[PDB]
Amino acid sequence: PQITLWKRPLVTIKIGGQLKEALLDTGADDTVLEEMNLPGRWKPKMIGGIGGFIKVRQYDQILIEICGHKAIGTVLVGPTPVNIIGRNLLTQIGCTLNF
């Protein structure tokens, strides 16, 4: 679809068999989700944002469906203020900016 930006670009995602809401975030290199249980192995990592750095669990090669489009990539889980979908997955679903 074409998404205007008068409201937050919030969409429903499916990950680990569970539905969630997440923000399409072109300013994020990576995808960061709030604390949750995910199956498989993970590795501890750090990620930095506007206010500093947080510890996250890195899950690689995770199936995630975004607004009806499938992606398989890295998902970081940790104390992010909101679920954000970053460019690593936005590219997979064919997302572009247009003006």
Contact in structure between 83 and 21 (CB atoms under 8 Å) = yes
| Residue 90 in the binding site for ligand NJG (CB under 6 A) | no
- The DSSP call for residue 67 is T
Report the residue from 85, 86, 89, 90 that binds ligand NJG according to the rule CB under 6 A.
Answer: 86
Based on the residue annotation, tell me whether 29 is a catalytic residue of this protein.
no
The interface partner of residue 45, options being ligand NJG, its own copies, none and the CB cut-off 5 to 8 Å by kind, is none
Phi first, then psi, for residue 94 (nearest 5°) are 80, 25
* In the complex, minimum distance from the CB of residue 7 to its own copies, in angstroms, rounded to a whole number: 8
Could you give the CA distance from residue 88 to residue 83 in angstroms, rounded to a whole number? 14
Catalytic residues: 25
